[PDB]
Structure formats: structure tokens, C-alpha cells
Amino acid sequence: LSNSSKVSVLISLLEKSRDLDYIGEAINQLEHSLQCAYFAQRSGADNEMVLAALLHDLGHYCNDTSFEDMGGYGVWQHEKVGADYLRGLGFSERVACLIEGHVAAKRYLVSSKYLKNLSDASRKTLEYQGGPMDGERRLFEEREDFKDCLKIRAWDEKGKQTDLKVPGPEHYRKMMEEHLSE
């Protein structure tokens, strides 16, 4: 009800993501989230970008943890799942669209570059996401948040560092609450 309890629910979600399978990645899902948010904040990005980075893979676990969907590597349309969850909590359409686009961003870059820059897990999930963008690249390039999405995606591919200390979920509590009141 209050933004503080709303945020407490998300922080609780995030904290729980820690104890979940790695879904084919080198570090846990909580760690992955925290790294992207770090790279985003330390880079000067705005709070909406930082929040989108932190929460971009929420959909792998917020409504189900059916990792078998993408052959063990994640939940079906996790980008849309997480995006809709946050729209539900009251997040900006901007955050939501950035999250929803992080998969399109992958599909784009792969058609326009990079498949080697992909983790083993990410390459594999592409074949449950519509594969390489064909035409599609035009619509995606015609997105207002086009560069933004690519940015999110950049941090996404970076947030896989083994043995890296980064601020925990609580570091982001004030940031989420403000976003909500806004």
C-alpha cells in the first residue's frame, strides 16, 4: 500500500532471488542484478536507468520460476513478465519499456554485429525469443529509448563478473521509493 512496503516487497523479492539456480550463468541472479545496477549508477545514468538495470531480470522469478521454459535458462518472456509486474507496482512506463526491451536489444545487436560476446546462457535463450531480428531492426531503431535499451543491454552483458563486491539491494531502497511517489 505505502511505497515503503511496496519497495520492501521488491527488496524481499530481490533478496530471495539469491537462493535460486544460476540458470546457466557464472554468478547468482541477485549478484547479476546488483552488478548491472552498479555499472549503471557509477556511470552517471539517471535513476530510471539504474532501476531498469537493477530489475531487468526480475521476470525470471517474480511470478514463477519455471526455468525449464527456455531449456533450463530462464522463464518464458521474462522481460515482459518483469515489465508487467513493475507496471503493476506503479513503476514508470519508461522503466517498464526499458526492461521489456532488453531482449529485443539482444536480438538487435546479434543481427547487427556479437554472438560471441554473449554468455552461453544468452545465446541459448535467443532461440526462445524469436532469434535474430529480421524489418524488425527498423521498428526497434524507431524506438524513442533505442540507445537507452542498447545501454541497458551493455551493462547486462557486463554484469557477470566473478568475485566482485557491489552495493546490496538496500542501497537502492530510497531510489525505488522516490520513483514510486513520482
> Binding site for (1R)-(2-amino-1-hydroxyethyl)phosphonate, residues?
25, 60, 106, 122-129, 153
Q: Hey, what's the cell of 104?
A: 529485443
- Least CB distance to Fe ion at residue 25 (A): 8
Q: Is 25 in the site for Fe ion (CB under 5 A)?
A: no
> Which DSSP letter does residue 92 get?
-
Of 25, 31, 48, 57, the residue at the interface with Fe ion (CB under 5 A) is 57
Least CB distance from residue 68 to Fe ion, whole Å?
A: 16
148 with 49: CB under 8 angstroms?
yes
Alpha-carbon gap, residue 71 to 65, rounded angstroms: 13
> Which residue ranges are tagged as binding site for Fe cation?
22, 32, 56-57, 78, 102, 156
CA-CA distances (angstroms) from residue 107 to 139, 152, 158, 160?
12, 14, 17, 19
Q: How far apart are CA 30 and CA 168, in angstroms?
A: 9
The minimum distance between CB 8 and Fe ion, in angstroms, equals 24
- Is 156 one of the binding residues for Fe ion (CB under 5 A)? yes
Binding mask 113-152 for Fe ion (x = CB under 5 A): ----------------------------------------
Nearest approach, Cβ of residue 123 and Fe ion (Å)? 13
d(CA 118, CA 114): 7
C-alpha cell at 60: 525470471
List of residues contacting Fe ion (CB under 5 A)? 57, 156
